[PDB]
Amino acid sequence: LSDNPQRQSVSGPLSSTVYGFVNNSMMVQLPGQPGIKPLTFANLINFKVD
């Protein structure tokens, strides 16, 4: 629940669980002058670990 600008959505049937619902809801933007900061250092350090 901490601010994670790279939060990935849950798609498909997994979107219909309470945990996935909370994860998906933690991303919607209210029209209240948004102040969440997109990360600035996200391209100069690449992690291709699979």
Add this chain to the structure above:
Amino acid sequence: NRGGQADPTKSLQAAGSSSSGVAKGALTILGGQICMLGLQKQLQA
């Protein structure tokens, strides 16, 4: 105040520093293409 070379391979040399290897993209496209054609053929069969 008065005074007094065309190297396409270079496109792959940037894959380590600010990764820009287009060969990775070409490989991904080719793999996805063979995957899609084979999948279509198998589903049709």
